[PDB]
Chains A and B, each alone.
Chain A
Amino acid sequence: NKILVKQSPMLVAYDNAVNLSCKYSYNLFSREFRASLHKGLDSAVEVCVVYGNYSQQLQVYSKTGFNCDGKLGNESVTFYLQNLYVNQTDIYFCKIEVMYPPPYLDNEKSNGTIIHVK
């Protein structure tokens, strides 16, 4: 099986910042997971990578010249993107994998979320 992903269809960044919540159909409390944000239709660029611990600790990484921050919450991960450029207006996709406790699962392709940076 696969995890489900609900993300807002549209978000306007105000003052070059936005909060992208990725809603999963899985209990990420006390789980070893790896959440991802990808930008672009071809999902090439990986914007942010939020690794989750069993003891609900987070290791957030911002890879491609993005200012990313991460917050965990039950069946969701929130990506707080700051200092976005206007030229970064695009479709963003939430990705997830759970490893422990088993089984290993990944997400079914989400519809994405259009971020308009103003």
Chain B
Amino acid sequence: DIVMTQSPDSLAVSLGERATINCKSSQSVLYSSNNKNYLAWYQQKPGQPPKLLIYWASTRESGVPDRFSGSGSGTDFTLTISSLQAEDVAVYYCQQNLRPPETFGQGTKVEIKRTVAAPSVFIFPPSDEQLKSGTASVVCLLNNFYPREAKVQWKVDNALQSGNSQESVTEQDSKDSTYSLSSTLTLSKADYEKHKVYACEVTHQGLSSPVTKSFNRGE
């Protein structure tokens, strides 16, 4: 029942610039006996187990670079990345280890802020193989765009689809610092054979006007 609250939930900072994450504990994790605050910071990159950065609020773990620095006491704390590196894009978590049960913050996603990149849109019709299994999936790909906020609309015969598609975003690329998106519209084979024009209208900040990729079933 010691609760940890981080802010912000998400943070985008330019290469080399300063990032700041706050962590607020519901009770004072300052142990009066040795004046040490029992608070740790972890870095978690996608698909990888977390990595300890800081412990005892400000004491830096072996091999963690000079740029990571913890600060604060009592209930409010702060992690500072002085010069954000590409290799620092991760979710940061704060954690109390003063008393059981040990509790974590919700996490803060840190991203690189970069110049705006417009996506490459591509559309993939359902394969001949998938149609033989009685299903149809049209896939809209957006490639290497920044920022993450991009709208994809599905139009079948100029009619807007709802709740029959799902988006999926990759993590920031290690080279471009851009995202990639895949929207998959799934219909029955019966429903697919009924309509002709299948299309995605991609709306992004890097585009002047919404790009559409389409195909006609059998062209």
Q: With contacts A27-B34, A54-B100, A101-B98 known, what are 9 further pairs, Cβ within 8 A? A: A27-B33, A29-B33, A30-B33, A32-B99, A99-B100, A100-B97, A100-B98, A101-B36, A101-B99
Residues of the B chain whose Cβ atoms lie less than 8 Å from the Cβ of A65: none
B99 touches A100 (CB 8 A): yes
| B102 and chain A: residue at smallest CB distance | A100
B38 touches A101 (CB 8 A): yes
| A28 and chain B: residue at smallest CB distance | B33
Residues of the B chain whose Cβ atoms lie less than 8 Å from the Cβ of A30: 31, 33
| Complexed CA–CA distance, A101 and B35 (Å) | 12
Secondary structure of the A side of the interface?
loop
8 Å CB contact of A100 from B33, B34, B36, B100: B100
| Complexed CA–CA distance, A100 and B34 (Å) | 13
Q: Which residues of B contact A (CB under 8 A)?
A: 31, 33-34, 36, 38, 97-100
CB distance from A32 to the nearest CB of B (A): 7
Q: Which of A54, A99, A101, A102 has the most CB of B within 10 A?
A: A101
| Complexed CA–CA distance, A27 and B31 (Å) | 11
Interface residues of A in 6-31 (CB under 8 A from B): 27, 29-30
| Complexed CA–CA distance, A102 and B31 (Å) | 11
Residues of the A chain whose Cβ atoms lie less than 8 Å from the Cβ of B33: 27, 29-30
| Complexed CA–CA distance, A54 and B38 (Å) | 14
Residues of the A chain whose Cβ atoms lie less than 8 Å from the Cβ of B97: 100-102
CB distance from B35 to the nearest CB of A (A): 12
| Complexed CA–CA distance, A102 and B102 (Å) | 11
| Complexed CA–CA distance, A29 and B157 (Å) | 73
Can you list 20 contacts pairing A with B, beta carbon distance less than 8 Å? A27-B34, A29-B33, A30-B31, A30-B33, A32-B99, A32-B100, A54-B98, A54-B99, A54-B100, A100-B97, A100-B98, A100-B100, A101-B31, A101-B36, A101-B38, A101-B97, A101-B98, A101-B99, A102-B38, A102-B97
| Complexed CA–CA distance, A99 and B38 (Å) | 13
CB distance from B124 to the nearest CB of A (A): 53
Please name the 7 residue pairs, one residue from A and one from B, whose CB atoms are nearest each other, closest first. A54-B99, A27-B33, A101-B38, A101-B98, A101-B31, A102-B97, A100-B99
Residues of the A chain whose Cβ atoms lie less than 8 Å from the Cβ of B99: 32, 54, 100-101
| Complexed CA–CA distance, A117 and B144 (Å) | 82
Q: Contact mask A35-51 → B, CB, 8 Å, 1/0? A: 00000000000000000
| Complexed CA–CA distance, A30 and B36 (Å) | 14
CB distance from B32 to the nearest CB of A (A): 8
| B98 and chain A: residue at smallest CB distance | A101
Residues of the A chain whose Cβ atoms lie less than 8 Å from the Cβ of B31: 30, 101
CB distance from B99 to the nearest CB of A (A): 5
CB distance from B30 to the nearest CB of A (A): 10
CB distance from B94 to the nearest CB of A (A): 16
Residues of the B chain whose Cβ atoms lie less than 8 Å from the Cβ of A99: 100
Residues of the B chain whose Cβ atoms lie less than 8 Å from the Cβ of A100: 97-100
Residues of the A chain whose Cβ atoms lie less than 8 Å from the Cβ of B98: 54, 100-101
Residues of the A chain whose Cβ atoms lie less than 8 Å from the Cβ of B38: 101-102
Residues of the B chain whose Cβ atoms lie less than 8 Å from the Cβ of A27: 33-34
